[PDB]
Amino acid sequence: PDIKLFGKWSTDDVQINDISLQDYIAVKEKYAKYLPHSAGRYAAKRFRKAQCPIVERLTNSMMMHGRNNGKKLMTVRIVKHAFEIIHLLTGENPLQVLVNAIINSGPREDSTRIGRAGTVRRQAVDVSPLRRVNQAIWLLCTGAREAAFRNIKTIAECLADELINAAKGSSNSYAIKKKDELERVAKSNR
Amino acid sequence: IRITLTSRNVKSLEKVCADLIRGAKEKNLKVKGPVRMPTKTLRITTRKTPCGEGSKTWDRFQMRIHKRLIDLHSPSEIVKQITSISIEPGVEVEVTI
Amino acid sequence: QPIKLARVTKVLGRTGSQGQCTQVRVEFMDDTSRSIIRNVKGPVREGDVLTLLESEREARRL
Amino acid sequence: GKAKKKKWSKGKVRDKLNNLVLFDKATYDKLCKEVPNYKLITPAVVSERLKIRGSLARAALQELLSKGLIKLVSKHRAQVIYTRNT
Amino acid sequence: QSVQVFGRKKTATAVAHCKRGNGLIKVNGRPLEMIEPRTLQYKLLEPVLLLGKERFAGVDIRVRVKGGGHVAQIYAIRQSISKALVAYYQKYVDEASKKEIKDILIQYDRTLLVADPRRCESKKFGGPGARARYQKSYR
Amino acid sequence: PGVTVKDVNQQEFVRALAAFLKKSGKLKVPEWVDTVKLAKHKELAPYDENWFYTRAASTARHLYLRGGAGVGSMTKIYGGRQRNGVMPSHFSRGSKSVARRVLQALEGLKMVEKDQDGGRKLTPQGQRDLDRIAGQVAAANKK
Amino acid sequence: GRVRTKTVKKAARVIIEKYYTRLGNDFHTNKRVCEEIAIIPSKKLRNKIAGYVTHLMKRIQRG
Amino acid sequence: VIPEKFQHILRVLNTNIDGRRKIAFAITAIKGVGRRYAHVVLRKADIDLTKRAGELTEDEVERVITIMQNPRQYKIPDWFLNRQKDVKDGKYSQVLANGLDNKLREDLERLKKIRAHRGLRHFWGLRVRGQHTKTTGRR
RNA sequence: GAGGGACAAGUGGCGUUCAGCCACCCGAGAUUGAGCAAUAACAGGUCUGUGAUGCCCUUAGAUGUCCGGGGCUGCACGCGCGCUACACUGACUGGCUCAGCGUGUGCCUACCCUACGCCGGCAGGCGCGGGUAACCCGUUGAACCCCAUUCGUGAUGGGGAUCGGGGAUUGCAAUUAUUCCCCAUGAACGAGGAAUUCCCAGUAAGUGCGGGUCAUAAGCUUGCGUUGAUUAAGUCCCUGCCCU
Ligand SMILES: [Mg+2]
Ligand SMILES: [Mg+2]
Ligand SMILES: [Mg+2]
Ligand SMILES: [Mg+2]
Ligand SMILES: [Mg+2]
Ligand SMILES: [Mg+2]
């Protein structure tokens, strides 16, 4: 009877401020599950992976690099700490700023090779919105990992810092750093 | 009083089991079921080659040991009468009183 | 330097030395029914709204 | 014998940086003065920002927890989560 | 008035004996509140937190699992509860409400009523795993 | 109300049961465990000084769970990952002198009954003791 | 992956050539009719032949 | 709450310099003391393990050094010591930092007079327990 | 044990009547993994698998066959398959909690699996019991994982290489190699250039167990379980191959 909620949350009124990322972020009411640790079978069909919730996708991309490859309980615990840290940092709900960080995590277009079998020039073309979501989550988890590499700060603390500094354009996060590193090359090869 | 029927293959096992059922269920004996044992498998892995050339290509030989048990509480004279069966040679019979 | 949005109508085919780009004749929302063909890499369906950074280009092949 | 390596990346973060084992008088007094000013009381921020080790940081945070100035939200394996009321 | 429903996770089988009562969940003598991972103390409560309390206090279910892994036992308990409610609503309560609660369970999650055919493949004689091979040696 | 040790979380139960065994004085510790005794095959000693009471409480919980375990059975109940260093790890077994020590101590303090087929099992006195201690730990939980 | 063998298609063509009134548009009936009017050892071959027989029935009945 | 005690750098057995992280892990810095022996000496000295090296009494330091130089008066049986029966004296003892290298030099000095191949492989650039030295032992 | 159950079948679109592709439901599965595997070769390897063998050599001071040793391991270097780490998503301690293949004795000729109780800190010893096996180890109480403590970015408590002393196990004997346990010595290693290997879902990877070797016996390999992703479902550019 009650509303579906992650922890003590609501999971409601999280509105995407723009278009081109709706129906691929599963923040809506028909994909609100209590824990990210679900039966992941979203790799048989080509386009069933977009129905995965983005918090589950963040856990799945967070678990990497052999020594942490697996351990969904551990990475769901890390995201459980991280949403709490984002909430204690001035409110400004962690699901809402997670969607905002996925929107503002960098690449709206990328440069790749074209055919003709000649000089490799790497002409900048458009990019899939699914690939935008994928590269967004990958850059956020990579930046959180290398920010929490060799420090007293935790994976969850640096992931919260990365999501806040990616939702806010303060030019201090790895998402904005690789946004510079990719969009300057894209405007150069335009 | 139990009898263990252990055969080489499941087809002759089921044939001699059906013959035992057809020869036992007409008398005044409360015949217990042919209790199915789990199938035993002896897995042997073989290099396939006398000398070391090529990829690691391995033979995997297996058997399927099938075992059945039946229970017939009776005097010992009835068990010797039931035991005399023109039987398939791939079937082994043990008795235990 | 404006930034426009565009939703996919049809998918033509795949292009590249790897075959990785996809020729998509997308459509134009903010203006009248104009038609260009762009190259999108990654998985894409029909009906996908997409952020464009330049609408003056037209990559065509025969 | 000889010493050879394929990568050349020297010049690390800060020159074998020290960190205080035991709290001082005026330093820990300043810590007690400015400790309500922080919004999120986490042992990593208290350790790295205020030149404290993790052991003395956890000891001071548990001491102020027993004093009652800082409220505990949810403690766990390594992410100890504290908050000041209002 | 007692129905036993079975498990069917990957290598986890949960015997769920359901019977009319006042509200009890037994997992090898240990109640519902004690879940062996502390992280998964919302996923196994998804039949509890969604379906209501008048159903929990109406149906007693005791569960015994002889599974293989912790996650497998958690999903085996979850699937055994979600199928034991369907079996009790077949055997005691009418189909006019059984179809409604089954539509609720299916529109929530397919894995509550549908078992998943995923088992680990055989390790091959060439490489160290099912698909992986060993490293080559060229010049 | 009826309180079972499965109804109560163990992580409060053993932490209180160590103190309630310190109150009774149900511990024998002859010479080597007075001095020092290490883990399974490890480098360091246990930290919290009441670890003998903790081993006795874990032994009491395991004999409440399974009736018929013994020295090697409880040794495999402890279980060990043997980090050999460069050579990879294996399953190593725990110690046997503590496994006979805790059983002999609880036998002398009337908490282990002998099974004619196996080993330890629960006494009615130990049943009453563990049930009252589980009830007061459940009272501290609900309070 | 329904690119089934010439022996399967030729057996189904012999079935639709000899016996047409016995066959219908239902797979569960045509599979049983084929096991009375032919001898097929393999159950997957039964299903394959009966599926192509139903496809031929849907082609013939329409056009 | 122990604000400050004027004790940072210690001098034990004329060569060793104690650290500042702990006491049970600053005794580790003494040669002849590794992992378990320091925690044994701490439990014989009955010091609370939370205490540092600088927060500890100098009389208790002298007591710890007394337990170091003579452990066999109270406890710590004959197996836990480093220098076992092969002494040329049969004295069960624990080596010092200045003593350990001297006993190793006496070991090697008498092995060179024995002319065992163990001492010969130690005198050459080889390994005693080096069962394979093809790739092992380069540079 | 048998039988059933899945066939692109029902719908719509893409297609020449078409062969066929795409989206959904019912379903447990919209198809999983292996074995066998065409004509024909490589002048690929095995005479060191055979009492399968042609030719050549030796045959009584023997290239035959026994006995005692050493050797195959021997290192100024280069290469391949692998194991462990370079930590805080971590190491230490304590508590908690879950498996599945398969193996095990008096053998066609010498032999185990192990419960219990006691002693010993430990590896181990002693007495007794069960199992020719869904019966006994064994409701394989496994590791990983979960909770709490300690450490706090230090070549640190990560790494445990090298090396010294002692104690037990099998063997007739382990020393210029066993193996395991206890203490101690505490190196490089700060995530690795040029290049290169494997992989599309219970899949890679983390992690442990069983067998083969054996008397003591894995870091090899074969199979099994636990946790368990990010990316593709496309092409002929790099490489290899097939067909005209
Ligand atoms: Mg040496
Ligand atoms: Mg060599
Ligand atoms: Mg051929
Ligand atoms: Mg012959
Ligand atoms: Mg190697
Ligand atoms: Mg190794």
Ligand SMILES: [Mg+2]
């Ligand atoms: Mg033998």
Ligand SMILES: [Mg+2]
């Ligand atoms: Mg050595």
Ligand SMILES: [Mg+2]
């Ligand atoms: Mg052998």
